């Protein structure tokens, strides 16, 4: 299992040949370095349709970094809320399976950028759509937090009624 | 493209930060100034260096200009064409000569 | 109280799973954007999964730093690899 | 070289801008000429309508 | 160092060329649509009015 294990994603050009182990095939060198770290990894990518200008690409990259930070913060808040509700039993993270699969199994595939997400538009449009979906999820989390606060207030009122 | 001058001490830092924040590629052809120039803000004759750079994208150019101005770098509209650059240099030289004359007159009058 | 502790809890769990999927997709998009900015077009980059041992994060980071024989625009804070993002 | 590389990059950027402008101008010219080419057909249709009126 | 600078210059030139090509492709699609659109519009405004 080792669900608590950290995750660090990376990518490199097809012509790359790392100087840490010169002369080794890129996949082979990565695996040996991964074996050096006793690690494993697999290919996971989707060819985006972004062909915007360099300035447009930089703006999109900054917006994507901001959106990724916001999404990570929202995911952490949701995980904390679930843990408060005694849901994150095994661990605070990666305990809950996603898409009928555990966290590493889900990470072992990245074809999600298709159909329901493949707008085939520019990167800006897809980023905006993902941001709107994340905002909707955050609103749902806020509604759940409000319901939890109302439940806490009701429990406090009941305790005051049965104080003694 | 962009063109400006900046202290020769911070030119390496400017190049590094420009190459980092702008993950894409860009051209950089900085050249150190021949003689130190009295900085207006520092009130000292510190060294200077050119900040010639060229890149595509209007937003990228605007961001580069904002970053350069953030590092207390003054920029000028250097003409790419040789004839236009020569004409601008001649006009600047004539204005500078007139300013030298009037400055000398004012300094002499004030000293007297 | 029962509603917030059961139905709201289940809805929040489902929303958290959905948000995790969306965040992974957004991270993939950001990695692709960086691989189009740092590395040069045309797109031929090869991505790698993020799986690593729980206690090997520092060693993996050091190995990646050693293997990052590119992006010399930095000093001879961002990672100098074509793409590098640590999650969880 | 660094200076030669910068000069080549500037020349390539200028050439790319000129090529993009030329392609846009050619596209606009083709779009305009399609109606201009259809203008002759419209004039022929007008002549045919006038001939039909004369026949009537 | 010169290899990195040359690679960066080549990548920047390729990006500029790709942006110009994308703009040209957009202009070409616009021209392909507008050729039929303007032909139909001229045909209407002239031939139908004459009819």
Swiss-Prot record, chain B:
Record's miscellaneous remark: Present with 55714 molecules/cell in log phase SD medium.
Stretch of the intact protein here: 186 to 297 of 840
Cited function: Subunit of the V0 complex of vacuolar(H+)-ATPase (V-ATPase), a multisubunit enzyme composed of a peripheral complex (V1) that hydrolyzes ATP and a membrane integral complex (V0) that translocates protons. V-ATPase is responsible for acidifying and maintaining the pH of intracellular compartments. Is present only in vacuolar V-ATPase complexes; enzymes containing this subunit have a 4-fold higher ratio of proton transport to ATP hydrolysis than complexes containing the Golgi/endosomal isoform and undergo reversible dissociation of V1 and V0 in response to glucose depletion.
Location(s), subcellular: Vacuole membrane
Subunit structure: V-ATPase is a heteromultimeric enzyme composed of a peripheral catalytic V1 complex (components A to H) attached to an integral membrane V0 proton pore complex (components: a, c, c', c'', d, e, f and VOA1).
Protein name listed in UniProt: V-type proton ATPase subunit a, vacuolar isoform
Post-translational modification note: Glycosylated.
Superkingdom as given in the UniProt entry: Eukaryota
Family note: Belongs to the V-ATPase 116 kDa subunit family.
Species of origin: Saccharomyces cerevisiae (strain ATCC 204508 / S288c)
Curated annotation (Swiss-Prot), chain D:
Assembly and interaction partners: V-ATPase is a heteromultimeric enzyme composed of a peripheral catalytic V1 complex (components A to H) attached to an integral membrane V0 proton pore complex (components: a, c, c', c'', d, e, f and VOA1).
Species this chain originates from: Saccharomyces cerevisiae (strain ATCC 204508 / S288c)
Miscellaneous section: Present with 2280 molecules/cell in log phase SD medium.
Residues where N-acetylserine is found: 1
Cellular localisation: Vacuole membrane
Sequence similarity: Belongs to the V-ATPase G subunit family.
The organism's taxonomic lineage, starting at the top: Eukaryota, Fungi, Dikarya, Ascomycota, Saccharomycotina
Full-protein positions shown: 2 to 57 of 114
Stated role: Subunit of the V1 complex of vacuolar(H+)-ATPase (V-ATPase), a multisubunit enzyme composed of a peripheral complex (V1) that hydrolyzes ATP and a membrane integral complex (V0) that translocates protons. V-ATPase is responsible for acidifying and maintaining the pH of intracellular compartments.
Official protein name in the record: V-type proton ATPase subunit G
């Amino acid at each position: 299992l080792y669900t608590a294990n950290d995750f660090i994603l990376i990518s490199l050009p097809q012509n790359a040949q790392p100087v840490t182990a010169p002369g080794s095939k890129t996949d082979s060198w990565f695996n040996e370095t991964l074996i050096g770290g006793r690690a494993f990894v697999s290919d996971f990518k989707i060819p985006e349709f972004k062909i915007g200008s360099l300035d447009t690409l930089i703006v999109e990259s900054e917006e994507l970094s901001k959106v990724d930070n916001q999404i990570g913060a929202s995911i952490g808040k949701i995980i904390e809320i679930l843990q408060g509700l005694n849901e994150t039993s095994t661990n605070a993270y990666r305990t809950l399976p996603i898409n009928n699969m555990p966290v590493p199994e889900y990470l072992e595939n990245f074809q999600w950028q298709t159909r329901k997400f493949k707008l085939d538009k520019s990167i800006k449009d897809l980023i905006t759509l993902i941001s709107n979906e994340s905002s909707q999820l955050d609103a749902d989390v806020r509604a759940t937090y409000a319901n939890y606060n109302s439940a806490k207030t009701n429990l406090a009122a009941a305790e005051r009624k049965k104080t003694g | 493209y962009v063109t400006g001058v900046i202290a020769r001490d911070k030119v390496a830092t400017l190049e590094q930060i420009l190459w980092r924040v702008l993950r894409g590629n860009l051209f950089f052809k900085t050249v150190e100034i021949e003689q130190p120039v009295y900085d207006v803000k520092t009130r000292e004759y510190k060294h200077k260096n050119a900040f010639i750079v060229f890149s595509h994208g209007d937003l990228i150019i605007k961001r580069i200009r904002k970053i350069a101005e953030s590092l207390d770098a003054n920029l000028y509209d250097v003409d790419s064409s040789n004839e236009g650059r020569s004409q601008q240099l001649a006009k600047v030289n004539k204005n500078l000569s007139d300013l030298y004359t009037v400055l000398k007159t004012t300094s002499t009058t004030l000293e007297s | 109280e029962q509603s917030l502790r059961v139905q709201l809890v289940r809805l929040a769990k489902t929303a958290y799973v959905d948000v995790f999927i969306n965040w992974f997709h957004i991270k993939a998009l950001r990695v692709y954007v960086e691989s189009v900015l740092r590395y040069g077009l045309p797109p031929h980059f090869n991505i790698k999964i993020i799986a690593v041992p729980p206690k090997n994060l520092s060693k993996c980071k050091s190995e990646l730093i050693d293997a990052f024989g590119f992006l010399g625009g930095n000093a001879f804070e961002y990672e100098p690899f074509v793409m590098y993002i640590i999650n969880l | 070289s660094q200076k030669n590389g910068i000069a080549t990059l500037l020349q390539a950027e200028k050439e790319a801008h000129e090529i993009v402008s030329k392609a846009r101008k050619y596209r606009q010219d083709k779009l305009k000429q399609a109606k201009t080419d259809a203008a002759k057909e419209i004039d022929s249709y007008k002549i045919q309508k006038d001939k039909e009126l004369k026949e009537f | 160092t010169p290899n990195q600078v040359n690679d960066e210059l080549n990548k920047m030139q390729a990006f500029i060329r790709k942006e110009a090509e994308e703009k040209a492709k957009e202009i070409q699609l616009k021209a392909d649509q507008e050729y039929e659109i303007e032909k139909t519009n001229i045909v209407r405004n002239e031939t139908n009015n004459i009819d």
